[PDB]
UniProtKB/Swiss-Prot annotation, chain A:
Transmembrane regions: none
Function recorded in the entry: Forms a fork protection complex (FPC) with TOF1 which is required for chromosome segregation during meiosis and DNA damage repair. FPC coordinates leading and lagging strand synthesis and moves with the replication fork. FPC stabilizes replication forks in a configuration that is recognized by replication checkpoint sensors and protects stalled replication forks against the fork-releasing activity of RRM3 helicase.
UniProt protein name: Chromosome segregation in meiosis protein 3
Whole-protein coverage range: 46 to 139 of 317
Species in which this protein is naturally found: Saccharomyces cerevisiae (strain ATCC 204508 / S288c) (Baker's yeast)
Other notes: Present with 358 molecules/cell in log phase SD medium.
Location in or out of the cell: Nucleus
From Swiss-Prot, chain B:
Subunit structure: Component of the fork protection complex (FPC) consisting of TOF1 and CSM3. Interacts with WSS1 and ESC4.
GO BP: any one term: mitotic sister chromatid cohesion
Keywords: Cell cycle, DNA damage, DNA repair, DNA replication inhibitor, Meiosis, Nucleus, Phosphoprotein
GO molecular function, one term: DNA binding
Localization per Swiss-Prot or TrEMBL: Nucleus
Known role: Forms a fork protection complex (FPC) with CSM3 and which is required for chromosome segregation during meiosis and DNA damage repair. FPC coordinates leading and lagging strand synthesis and moves with the replication fork. FPC stabilizes replication forks in a configuration that is recognized by replication checkpoint sensors and protects stalled replication forks against the fork-releasing activity of RRM3 helicase.
Gene label: TOF1
Family affiliation: Belongs to the timeless family.
Full protein: residues contained: 13 to 781 of 1238
GO cellular component terms attached to this protein's record: cytosol; nuclear replication fork; nucleus; replication fork protection complex
Identification of the protein by name: Topoisomerase 1-associated factor 1
Organism of provenance: Saccharomyces cerevisiae (strain ATCC 204508 / S288c) (Baker's yeast)
Further comment: Present with 952 molecules/cell in log phase SD medium.
UniProtKB/Swiss-Prot annotation, chain C:
Note: Present with 8800 molecules/cell in log phase SD medium. Early fractionation of eukaryotic MCM proteins yielded a variety of dimeric, trimeric and tetrameric complexes with unclear biological significance. Specifically a MCM467 subcomplex is shown to have in vitro helicase activity which is inhibited by the MCM2 subunit. The MCM2-7 hexamer is the proposed physiological active complex.
Coiled-coil boundaries: none
Residues of the full protein shown: 174 to 467 of 933
Disulphide bridges, residue numbers: none
Record localization: Nucleus
Family: Belongs to the MCM family.
Protein name (database record): DNA replication licensing factor MCM4
Purpose of the protein: Acts as a component of the MCM2-7 complex (MCM complex) which is the putative replicative helicase essential for 'once per cell cycle' DNA replication initiation and elongation in eukaryotic cells. The active ATPase sites in the MCM2-7 ring are formed through the interaction surfaces of two neighboring subunits such that a critical structure of a conserved arginine finger motif is provided in trans relative to the ATP-binding site of the Walker A box of the adjacent subunit. The six ATPase active sites, however, are likely to contribute differentially to the complex helicase activity.
Protein origin, superkingdom: Eukaryota
Curated annotation (Swiss-Prot), chain D:
UniProt record similarity statement: Belongs to the MCM family.
Gene expressing this chain: MCM6
Extra information: Present with 13400 molecules/cell in log phase SD medium. Early fractionation of eukaryotic MCM proteins yielded a variety of dimeric, trimeric and tetrameric complexes with unclear biological significance. Specifically a MCM467 subcomplex is shown to have in vitro helicase activity which is inhibited by the MCM2 subunit. The MCM2-7 hexamer is the proposed physiological active complex.
Subcellular location(s) of the protein: Nucleus
Name recorded for this polypeptide: DNA replication licensing factor MCM6
Lineage: Eukaryota, Fungi, Dikarya, Ascomycota, Saccharomycotina
Length: 94, 665, 294, 318
DNA sequence: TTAGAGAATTGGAGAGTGTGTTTTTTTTTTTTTTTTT
DNA sequence: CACACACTCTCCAATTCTCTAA
């Protein structure tokens, strides 16, 4: 009957288990900065982790595109706001 | 209807052959009744194009070549008939037909515009009639090498010879006619292409934009030929005497001319700051360095050689990428894995006026010949030293009265003329020391500051951006002038005091909207803001409070979006941006305001070997900034691990968490 | 942690492949070949003690020449590298692409780490190549079969003829019809990875981007038809022949009627049933893609 | 009323190198000065050639490559040599400005209106000569000289050089439509009232045709290294350079090496594709392959292999 | 001033229509011209 | 004939624009 609805980023995907919680678990281990490298290699070490994780969550879209989409969703969704403030409230509590 | 069109063409073609001919005894002879044929053709232009808004007569007079085969030869012979007599020092009859030939030249050369109020027939013919106007410009500039421009100045001399007081209005009209003729011959400019979009694109785009007639080159129409024909026909000497003799009727046509042939010259070519072979060599070494980077990204064997990589990733799973270059370079592999994605997010992207510094590309430059470049710079230097000061003083009065009547075209050709001349004359007085700055001292006078500021304010309030853009340009130049005269040394303080509350809020709002508009708009906002902050810093209401008015996410957004275009920016504009990021990082300690991901990608894309040139002065301070940025980012992340998500998203406004996010207790 | 790079289908690590081959491409004394075959009575100080590939590379730099010949048996002669010989026979296209780049890394290390005074861009601009030879036992052209697809093979034959040289595109060059902007677009498996839209975000027009053939960049391809050598034929019938594609610097190595020995990867490709469709014949055209000729 | 998009030519990107070549070539053509004939003297030989052209109304300019080679450390001759096909529109646009300066009578074909004149820039006297066997795709778009012997010459035929069309749907006119290797009609009508993208007719009065000839040449029978088969090349001659050679003759040609597409696969108006592997994945090909010949496009031709009146002969001799 | 609800325009799914495709080509007889028979 | 490609037509929903109250 219909055309298939478009797959699109939303908190029900972006908040889900391999998702922001996967970043909070793995990134502090996998992303390493030093003045012993040039700035361009440090930037590449940051960007690798997020590029592979963005490919795992939403393989449809390029990395710059995924960033523009995350900006619009974090600006609009109240549940995503509630999750982010909840993370900061934990660090303030400690 | 079509019978009416073919009868109109037949009637005008029979009038066109009635004017005269080569005589063949070749020396062009006036037809008997030529004056009546010229007056009848003027009647045809009026009684059709005014009365019915058609453009059909103005179209078909080009078909039968009336301008290039009758009006031009008639004016050029009459010029010779008066030049010879002046060197010897019914001519009262031939005056009337020379005047009426100039009248028809001005009508045929009049600028074309299309609007909501435009006729269904005018919008049909518009794109075509621009081609005939291009042929008219080529023919006017090249037919006996601008002897017709010499005939035009002669018809002006005929009324300059009788006194400023003892003249009649029917002669001041002739002055305005001759000035309008020159502004037209200048401002014939190649047309826009236009497509109907009711029907979607085929599998190729618009395969040619080339809006030129079959025997016109782009160079036959360029300012090089304009400057050449003006210098050879002593036009500049006429304009210079005219703009000095102002001690009201004509000031606005005269400003229009100075706008129409200063508009697209970026001034910096007028100042260099085997030489052309050395210049060619340096550019070939930059293209060689770029091709060296492309060669370092290219296959060392053929296209079909077929090597295939698998990338293991966390969750102990595979991707695959083709090509020998990807096997060895992990960064190329991941770049290729993103390049192949068949999705793109849909982008969003953005009037009767000429193409100008508002609209032309940031990289655009007009290539003067060496004699043309000296003939131009000497003309404008004489004009600045003679007449700019009195001309600006006159038109700023005429438009401080009468503001509400200025339709957008007058408003631009005033604002841009003011900005371009003040920028050129600041730059001349930078390199030359015998240039006075104070020669343009009129620009800082209170009446002109008030006009420029009022005009920008009303354009912003009425949301007329083309005028706000022109306002922002002129205000940026007035600020450059103020800063220069302050460094040289009370009129500075009067203007500097005059913006303390409301213009501050306006100029702070300008970059917040900037991210919605063209590269030229963002460029102007950034140049203005750099100049403002440099002024307010030098003067110290409260620098910390006023800059905190600028330190907000929407401004950082338009700065990132201007910096995304960097491959087509110049080192000056990149140095302005990174000075502002240095100001935000060091002077404010705002640093969380910049940690968003868009900046991190953009630093990598320009710090890359494929990005900025390694020998560029521009790369050196980007590399320095990046080292400080990554140090503060590492510190922030080690102290607060949540910043990995906070860096991915825009900032929060729930009060306690929003403060903690921004500053780390 | 590190996203490991693996030759597809193999469980072979490209880092281990590279970091072995580098440590063969220097430290290999020719002494080790005269241990491999023995003849070990014959060992001569002047040749055999010299670092063989160091001398080869210093010659390449000074001659300004881009191609290193490599007798594959040297890989077996050196303890660390015996398994790389087996990888070179089994996975040629990737293993040769690793060796090609390792040469270029070595050429740079041999001047910058050695801090010797020479022009760097003169080396950075070159496409270096390995040309492996002596790869294994030669075999009859008639003894080829589909078990051999995508492997190095060693053939002997008589050249029947060469085509005139064929331009094979390596970089497509595109221009925006609306805005005059231009792009170098990388060719990949013979497909042009065409852009959908103008790359200038100030333009971004779809479909208006177009190809300019004489501003593209090309490799040299040549077909040689090679006949089976009369020593190898079964005497009941005619010799066979095989087409071979010779590439880049190897184009016009051979005259017609040369006897040659070739090392190449044995290839198969599908071919179109009809030139207007992607319908393919179920049995594939085969050729050798040569990497050395003697 | 319409829905329409205006589309403005001023926002086109400029080739900064192309324009720096135009200026260096413009300065060379006027100033070059040097002469040794009769005595040590200044002549401005390319201005002297333009003033010669002004008399006869000839539409070609010959340029000695050694004059470019010595000018301004030879960076101009290096750029023109290595990237000739990129720079040629800039060379022609540079020459037009110099001809406009010193002989504006030539600037048209020179009553009805007389057209734009097209100028064949004819480089000659290169430092080095290549054989047909020395040709390699690495030199595409670069200025060579080639030595060979002619086996055949085609008819002299007209190329459609700049096309002009009228829209059958609205009767508008499109002009200056540049032609690639295929025939090419406009994709969009210039009238914003018109939804047309096809259905075009050529105006044969307003469109402009170059003269053109294919000549087939081969490697010289004394040069072939072992008496093997003679390798051949297709050379294209245009403008004044047509019929300047003959079969069995020995010639030196100079011009660009070019890649010619196999145009049937490129979707040519009203023709079927024909039936070695090409390249694919392009809007105009869809599923097809595009394949390529090497050809040469010669700007200058010279052979290396009765007017019985004293009134002509005694003026023919020096 | 932020943020959320309602209105307009664009993208592309996918349905629909229309076109081209097999394909060969040496062999065997008859003739008319050069030259080597 | 029938089955792929080339190309146009049409509808539907997805995204962004614009206005209002919290
Ligand atoms: Zn573009
Ligand atoms: Zn039409």
């Amino acid at each position: 009957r219909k055309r298939r609805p478009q797959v699109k980023l939303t908190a029900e995907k972006l908040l889900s288990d391999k998702g922001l919680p996967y970043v909070l678990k793995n990134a502090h281990k996998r992303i390493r900065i030093s003045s012993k490298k040039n700035s361009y290699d440090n930037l590449s070490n940051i960007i690798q982790f997020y590029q592979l994780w963005a490919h795992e969550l939403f393989p449809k879209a390029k990395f710059k595109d995924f960033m523009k989409i995350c900006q619009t969703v974090g600006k609009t969704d109240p549940v995503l706001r509630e999750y982010r403030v909840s993370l900061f409230r934990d660090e303030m509590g400690m | 209807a079509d019978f009416s069109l073919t009868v109109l063409r037949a009637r005008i073609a029979l009038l066109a052959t009635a004017i005269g001919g080569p005589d063949y005894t070749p020396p062009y002879k006036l037809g008997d009744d030529c004056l009546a044929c010229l007056k009848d053709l003027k009647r045809w232009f009026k009684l059709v194009d005014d009365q019915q808004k058609r453009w059909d007569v103005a179209m078909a007079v080009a078909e039968y070549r009336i301008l290039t085969d009758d009006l031009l030869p008639i004016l050029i012979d009459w010029e010779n008939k008066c030049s010879l007599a002046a060197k010897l020092a019914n001519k009262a009859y031939y005056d009337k037909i020379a005047l009426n030939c100039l009248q028809l030249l001005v009508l045929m050369t009049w600028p074309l515009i299309v609007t909501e109020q435009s006729s269904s027939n005018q919008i049909t013919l518009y794109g075509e009639l621009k081609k005939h106007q291009l042929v008219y410009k080529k023919t006017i500039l090249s037919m006996e090498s601008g002897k017709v421009l010499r005939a035009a100045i002669r018809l002006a001399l005929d009324v300059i010879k009788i006194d400023r007081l003892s003249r009649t209005p029917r002669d001041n009209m002739v002055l305005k006619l001759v000035l309008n003729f020159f502004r037209n011959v200048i401002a014939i400019e190649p047309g826009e292409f236009t497509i109907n979009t009711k029907k979607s694109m085929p599998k190729k785009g618009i395969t040619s934009i080339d809006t030129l007639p079959p025997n016109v080159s782009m160079d036959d129409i360029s300012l090089n030929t304009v400057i050449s024909s003006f210098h050879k026909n002593k036009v500049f000497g006429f304009l210079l005497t005219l703009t000095s003799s102002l001690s009201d009727f004509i000031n606005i046509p005269l400003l229009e001319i100075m706008f129409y042939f200063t508009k697209d010259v970026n001034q910096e070519l007028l100042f260099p700051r085997t030489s052309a072979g050395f210049e060619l060599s340096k550019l070939l070494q930059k293209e060689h360095q770029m091709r060296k980077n492309v060669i370092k990204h290219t296959s060392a064997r053929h296209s079909r050689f077929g090597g295939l990589l698998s990338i293991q990733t966390p969750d102990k799973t595979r991707l695959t990428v083709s090509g020998s270059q990807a096997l060895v370079d992990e960064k190329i592999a991941l770049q290729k894995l993103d390049d192949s994605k068949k999705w793109n997010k849909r982008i969003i992207k953005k009037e009767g006026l000429p193409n100008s510094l508002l609209n032309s590309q940031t990289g655009k430059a007009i290539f003067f010949t060496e004699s043309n470049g000296k003939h131009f710079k000497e003309f404008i230097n004489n004009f600045i030293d003679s007449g700019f000061n009195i001309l600006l003083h006159s038109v700023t009065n005429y438009f401080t009265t009468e503001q509400d009547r200025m339709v957008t075209l007058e408003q631009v050709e005033y604002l841009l003329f003011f900005a371009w001349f003040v920028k050129y004359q600041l730059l001349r007085s930078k390199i030359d020391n015998s240039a006075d700055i104070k020669q343009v001292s009129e620009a800082l006078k209170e009446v002109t500051f008030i006009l420029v500021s009022s005009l920008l304010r009303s354009a912003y309030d009425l949301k007329n951006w083309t005028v706000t853009h022109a306002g922002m340009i002129a205000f940026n130049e007035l600020l450059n002038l103020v800063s220069r005269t302050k460094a040289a040394q009370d009129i500075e303080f009067i203007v500097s005091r005059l913006f303390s509350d409301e213009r501050i809020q306006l100029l702070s709002n300008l970059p917040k909207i900037g991210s919605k508009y063209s590269l030229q708009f963002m460029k102007s906002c950034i140049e203005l803001t750099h100049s403002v902050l440099k002024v307010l810093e030098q003067y110290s209401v409260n620098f910390q409070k006023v800059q905190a008015n600028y330190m907000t996410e929407p401004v950082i957004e338009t700065y990132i979006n201007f910096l995304e275009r960097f491959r087509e920016l110049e080192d000056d504009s990149i140095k302005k941006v990174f000075s502002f990021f240095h100001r935000v990082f060091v002077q404010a300690k705002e640093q969380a305001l910049l940690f968003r991901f868009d900046l991190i990608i953009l630093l990598r894309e320009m710090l890359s070997p494929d990005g900025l040139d390694r020998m560029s002065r521009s790369r050196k301070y980007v590399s320095q900034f990046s080292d400080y940025f990554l140090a503060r980012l590492k510190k922030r992340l080690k102290k607060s691990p949540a910043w990995f998500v906070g860096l991915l998203f825009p900032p929060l406004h729930n009060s306690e968490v929003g403060f903690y996010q921004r500053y780390g207790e | 942690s590190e996203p490991l790079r693996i030759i597809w289908g193999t469980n072979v690590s490209i880092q281990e492949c590279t970091t072995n081959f580098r440590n063969f491409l220097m430290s290999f004394k020719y002494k080790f070949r005269k241990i491999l075959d023995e003849r070990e009575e014959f060992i001569n100080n002047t040749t055999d003690e010299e670092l063989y590939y160091i001398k080869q590379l210093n010659e390449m730099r000074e001659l300004g020449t881009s191609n290193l010949n490599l007798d594959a048996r040297n890989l077996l002669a050196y303890k660390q590298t015996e398994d790389l010989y087996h990888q070179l026979l089994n996975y040629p296209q990737e293993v040769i692409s690793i060796m090609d780049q390792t040469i270029k890394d070595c050429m740079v290390s041999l001047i910058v780490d050695n801090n010797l005074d020479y022009d760097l861009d003169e080396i950075e601009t070159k496409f270096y190549k390995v040309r492996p030879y002596n790869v294994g036992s030669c075999k009859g052209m008639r003894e080829l079969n589909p078990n051999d697809i995508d492997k190095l093979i060693n053939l002997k034959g008589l050249v029947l003829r060469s085509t005139p040289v064929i331009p094979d595109m390596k970089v497509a060059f595109f221009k925006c019809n609306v805005c005059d902007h231009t792009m170098a677009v990388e060719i990949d498996r013979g497909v042009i990875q065409e852009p959908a839209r103008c790359e200038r975000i100030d333009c971004n027009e779809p479909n208006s981007m177009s190809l300019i053939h004489n501003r593209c960049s090309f490799a040299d391809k040549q077909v040689i038809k090679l006949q089976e050598t009369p020593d190898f034929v079964p005497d009941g019938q005619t010799p066979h022949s095989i087409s071979l594609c010779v590439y880049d610097e190897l184009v016009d190595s051979c005259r017609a009627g040369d006897r040659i020995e070739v090392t190449g990867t044995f290839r198969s490709i599908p071919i179109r049933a009809n030139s207007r469709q992607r319908v393919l014949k179920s049995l594939y055209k085969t050729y050798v893609d040569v990497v050395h000729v003697k | 009323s319409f829905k329409s998009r205006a589309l403005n030519h001023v926002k086109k990107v400029d080739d900064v190198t192309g324009e720096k070549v135009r200026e260096a070539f413009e300065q060379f053509l006027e100033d070059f000065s040097v002469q040794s004939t009769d005595t040590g003297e200044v002549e401005k030989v390319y201005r002297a050639q333009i003033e010669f052209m002004k008399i006869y109304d000839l539409n070609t300019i010959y340029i000695d490559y050694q004059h470019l080679s010595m000018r301004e450390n030879g960076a101009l001759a290096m750029a023109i040599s290595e990237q000739y096909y990129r720079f040629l529109p800039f060379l022609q646009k540079g020459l037009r400005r110099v001809v406009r300066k010193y002989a504006p009578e030539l600037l048209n074909t020179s009553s009805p209106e007389q057209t734009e004149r097209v100028f064949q820039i004819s480089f000659f006297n290169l430092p080095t000569v290549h054989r047909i066997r020395d040709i390699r795709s690495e030199k595409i778009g670069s200025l060579l000289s080639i030595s060979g012997t002619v086996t055949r010459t085609s008819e002299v035929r007209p190329e459609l050089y700049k096309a002009s069309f009228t829209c059958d749907m609205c009767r508008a006119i499109v002009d200056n439509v540049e032609q690639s290797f295929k025939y090419t009609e406009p994709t969009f009508c210039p009238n914003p009232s018109c939804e047309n993208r096809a259905f075009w007719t050529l105006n044969v009065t307003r469109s402009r045709f170059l003269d053109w000839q294919k000549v087939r040449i081969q490697e010289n029978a004394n040069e072939i290294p072992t008496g093997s088969m003679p390798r051949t090349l297709d050379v294209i001659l245009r403008g004044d350079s047509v019929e300047r050679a003959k079969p069995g003759d020995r010639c030196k040609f100079t011009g660009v090496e070019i890649v010619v597409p196999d145009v049937t696969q490129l979707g040519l108006p009203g023709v079927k594709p024909s039936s070695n592997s090409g390249v694919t994945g392009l809007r105009s090909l869809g599923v097809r392959d595009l394949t390529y010949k090497i050809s040469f496009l010669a700007c200058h031709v010279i052979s290396i292999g009765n007017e019985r009146d004293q009134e002509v002969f005694l003026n023919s001799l020096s």
